[PDB]
Design a protein around this ligand. Sequence first.
Ligand SMILES: CCCCCCCCCCCCCCCCCC(=O)OC[C@H](COP(=O)(O)OCCN)OC(=O)CCCCCCCCCCCCCCCCC
Ligand SMILES: CCCCCCCCCCCCO[C@@H]1O[C@H](CO)[C@@H](O[C@H]2O[C@H](CO)[C@@H](O)[C@H](O)[C@H]2O)[C@H](O)[C@H]1O
Ligand code: SF4
Ligand code: SF4
Ligand code: SF4
Lengths: 176, 70, 309, 45, 144, 154, 99
Amino acid sequence: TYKYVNLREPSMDMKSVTDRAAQTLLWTELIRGLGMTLSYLFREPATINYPFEKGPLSPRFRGEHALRRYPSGEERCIACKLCEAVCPAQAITIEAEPRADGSRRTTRYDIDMTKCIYCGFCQEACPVDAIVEGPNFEFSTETHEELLYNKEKLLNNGDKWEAEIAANIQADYLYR
Amino acid sequence: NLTLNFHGVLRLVMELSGEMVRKCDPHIGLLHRGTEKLIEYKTYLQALPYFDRLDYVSMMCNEQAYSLAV
Amino acid sequence: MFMINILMLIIPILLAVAFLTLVERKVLGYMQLRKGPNVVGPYGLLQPIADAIKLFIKEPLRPATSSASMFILAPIMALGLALTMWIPLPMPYPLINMNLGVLFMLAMSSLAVYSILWSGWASNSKYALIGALRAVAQTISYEVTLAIILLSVLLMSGSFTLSTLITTQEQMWLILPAWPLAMMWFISTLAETNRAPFDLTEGESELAGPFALFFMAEYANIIMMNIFTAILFLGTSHNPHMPELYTINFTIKSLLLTMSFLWIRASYPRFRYDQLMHLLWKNFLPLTLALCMWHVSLPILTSGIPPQT
Amino acid sequence: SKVKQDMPPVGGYGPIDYKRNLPRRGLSGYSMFAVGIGALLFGYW
Amino acid sequence: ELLQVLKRGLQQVSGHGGLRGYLRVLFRANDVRVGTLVGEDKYGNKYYEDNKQFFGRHRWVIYTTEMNGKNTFWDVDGSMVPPEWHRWLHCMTDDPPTVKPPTARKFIWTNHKFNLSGTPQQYVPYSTTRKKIQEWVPPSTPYK
Amino acid sequence: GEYVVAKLDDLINWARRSSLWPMTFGLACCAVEMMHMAAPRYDMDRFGVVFRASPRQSDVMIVAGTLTNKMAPALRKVYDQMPEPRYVVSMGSCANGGGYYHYSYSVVRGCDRIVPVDIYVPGCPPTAEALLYGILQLQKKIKREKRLRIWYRR
Amino acid sequence: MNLMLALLTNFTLATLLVIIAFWLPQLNVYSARLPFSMKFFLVAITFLLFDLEIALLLPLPWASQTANLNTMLTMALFLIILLAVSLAYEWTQKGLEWT
Ligand SMILES: CCCCCCCCCCCCCCCCCC(=O)OC[C@H](COP(=O)(O)OCCN)OC(=O)CCCCCCCCCCCCCCCCC
Ligand SMILES: CCCCCCCCCCCCO[C@@H]1O[C@H](CO)[C@@H](O[C@H]2O[C@H](CO)[C@@H](O)[C@H](O)[C@H]2O)[C@H](O)[C@H]1O
Ligand code: SF4
Ligand code: SF4
Ligand code: SF4
């Protein structure tokens, strides 16, 4: 099924021809366009007062990464390296060894935030909810080196943002 | 024939005679990033996000085309 | 006392231009469902000052100019001419009362094209000279209709004195007997000042201190065209014992016409170069010539010839 | 517990416009010319 | 209604506790709207809502003038919002932390920090792993 | 002599950060989010950031997208033509360090190999709000400048 | 006198702003034929010729005070009509096309 967007014959009777002549000489369609921009002048603008107001986001928002803990404070990450395997950008680098208590834990967990594409595949792959993309998006830096996160940086993000991260996961985990 | 040397970024090499355009020669590759080669080092899931970044105005349509093929 | 008076004209003009840039950005913003400058000062009232200071301490980057003399002349000519256009304006009294004030304004604006020409010669670049020659060809073309339209209007006024236009419109605005000429006059001012939808220097080029001075000259001209349009077609009644009543009514009309330039810029796409030339040579010029013929005949056939003085 | 999923309301959503709606305004060409000529004549007088 | 519009404008001066408070919010936040005080966090940020305003402007924060020893009268920053209010301010939820407080954990930062980039507190990357190859150390007693 | 210099820094710093005119290298995806920061919700113009300016009038270059090897010389040429003071904002993973094309034979691994960068905005793409946070951060950086204080201590 | 002072002030101020615009601290311690159409020459020349005849129309506001209105009106229209013939000639000889 189709329709023609521009297949019409103008009426060539004198009244129609004078209507087109009046439009040409008196600029009527142009005046109508001015009415439209005038109507917008008196409309309330759509601008929000950043940073005092913020754009709406949802619990699924993919922002700055962070490493999480169990309620006891033990790390959730068990160095399975599934995040590192799935990462489309190869932005994750991991090393691990048996910890002094025999636990399976990482000794390196780096995310190159300038390789990362913020796709969220790592938090989908993680079997224990250790690596997440948090809700923060206001972490621009003055140097490139500040965006090469190591494990310390990522654990601090987890301790910094856990209150919000736990609430967001609560809101969306039944969709996962 | 006056020669002029100049969505993304484009380089147009044009030949004009007065107001008219005799020849338009688009010089592209300014955003060539070897996506097709990079996909050969990805799993099928790992390749999917590359399709968001082709026509990066129609992201999920590009996703759909790749998904249907797979 | 006269040097005080000169300064009471010059300094306010530059202030009005500075804050026209704020008003343009806010009016365009609100027509675009946004706000425009509202952070730098309350309601953006300090934005012009920040922009002006920023421009004047920017690095003045001079490329190898072909002619140093002509690199300095063009902005001096542009700014000096723009300021000069204001000295015969009756608001309601002119700074200088010229018997031939309308001709003086016609004579002075016809020299404004030299700054475009000299800046292309000073640009030391073939493409900049070509762009400057296109702008000149556009400017001089619309000078043709403006002069003929102006003569047609003055056949109802009877004088080249600007303050006579006030007397002529004592009972009624000239827009009523002359709205076809007012329509083409107004469009001609837009194309004359290279304003949208005739902003082809910006459009074609797209495909610090000295820059600011050219900008101030251009915006001083835009206000002055619209002041002139207000005097020519929307004459304000003048009461000799309360001259400030004229100035307020006069100012409001001028501001509204100036904002209509802004309104128009927000509403239309741009002309193609050949298309705006056709608009003048094949549309406005034929109709202005016919209306010049008509307006020579009309006072004679109605017995409405105005007085010589 | 019963399955709970994003679904349309029972009976569906209300109608949604999509056709072009550019309403006709203004006078005929005759009337517009008549007003313009009338204005000129008053101004001349 | 032109009178009622001006009355509301005058009520905003009173709503901000006089002309000084009115001018303070005008010059700090470029906005003089009066809203309902939803709450205040431990850093002095205050949170307001007005559900007559369109989505996006119906919630806002007035940043404290002093945070973690930094003068923030003029230098406000989006990172100054602590996580528990961050969820509410960005409309990830409808419940402010006053009504639905976050779950308490011993390792959660008691004191929020804003973006520290460009300061002496900035993050500096380094390798977190230990040396892998151990060099032989020659004896300290001669016997060539 | 020292009170004056501090106040004069404050004035010129205020003027430059209050009037930041960007030239946008809209190279790829990230340029879309830049357009959204110009769009009504955020309206960069309300901060004194003009929608578009030519390079010769520009104070800040926003590198919004992947920088290919083919494009690098042109980007450097535009930067060299900017009058000073000039600043560069690197927007998004590609410009930051190559991002998703970091291992490509045809891609510059970060625009800071070509030009000095003042601010790095993370994300793929950063949200329009995230870019605006970056721009405001650059304004704060300009506010910390002490050009005349260092000049008079020379 | 007043006119000469006004002119001197305008361009003197423009000169001062320009030279000041060029000199500020900085604080730094370290003859051919243009490939341009014959069409643009004809626009300039056409403007010139039309401008010369507008010079002849400028006196019309004064001429309408004449007692010899028969002659004045005829000559005024004769001039404008010849101006229209000039345009019609340019137009029909393709002097106004840009292609
Ligand atoms: C009793 C006897 C009396 C004798 C005298 C009788 C005379 C009265 C009847 C005649 C009235 C003449 C009308 C005069 C206006 C000029 C008309 C005109 O030239 O318009 C045509 C022009 C081109 O039209 P186009 O459709 O593109 O193509 C036709 C050419 N082939 O189209 C255009 O010009 C388009 C305009 C371009 C500018 C667009 C931007 C602004 C538009 C909105 C402006 C709003 C109005 C401004 C008013 C100013 C007031 C000071
Ligand atoms: C209109 C009223 C204004 C009143 C304010 C008066 C304040 C006078 C102090 C001006 C200080 C200018 O500050 C200085 O400006 C010049 C631009 O020309 C900049 O640029 C300068 O420095 C850089 C290196 O730093 C040079 O490579 C460059 O060639 C040079 O132009 C400087 O980076 C900036 O430090
Ligand atoms: S968000 Fe995607 S690109 Fe970034 S670390 Fe996780 S898996 Fe890798
Ligand atoms: S973060 Fe999760 S997926 Fe990655 S290594 Fe640790 S446990 Fe495995
Ligand atoms: S950083 Fe991401 S969004 Fe930006 S250009 Fe690169 S792939 Fe596209």
